[PDB]
Write a structure and sequence with these properties.
Layout: H1 2-28, H2 32-62, H3 66-95, H4 98-125
Helix pairs in contact: 1-2, 1-4, 2-3, 3-4
Length: 126
């Protein structure tokens, strides 16, 4: 069902946010091995998040829930931007561009925060 997916989707956003913030803390501490570990887990969770948003858009389309498709579309537009920020963050990490990495971390975390309120609305539309 569409509700079965939303339940997984809703749980994963706050986990992602927490790991982005842990990545930042570990980076300021110099714990680069843990930064890497956190990034490795973030790529998995982010892939999971994006796949669920698309699947729910497909599922909400089948049911004619036009309101949910629309909420899911603006969330997918944000996800696409986060994906590009993520890719730039990973390259900054590998290059040791500390100022780029630190700035990208801020931008990603703020985008992560901005996603959560809209996830709430999706609960209501399904």
């Amino acid at each position: 069902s569409l509700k079965e997916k939303f339940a997984e989707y809703e749980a994963i956003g706050p986990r992602i946010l927490e790991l982005w913030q842990a990545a930042r803390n570990a980076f300021e501490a110099g714990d680069l091995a843990r930064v890497a570990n956190l990034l490795a887990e973030l790529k998995e969770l982010f892939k999971k998040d994006l796949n669920l948003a698309n699947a729910m858009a497909a599922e909400a389309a089948e049911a004619g829930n036009k309101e949910a498709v629309a909420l899911l579309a603006e969330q997918l537009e944000r996800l696409k931007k986060i994906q590009a920020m993520f890719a730039a963050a990973v390259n900054a990490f590998r290059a040791g561009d500390r100022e780029a990495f630190g700035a990208l971390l801020e931008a990603i975390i703020n985008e992560g925060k901005a996603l959560l309120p809209l996830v709430e609305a999706i609960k209501e539309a399904i």
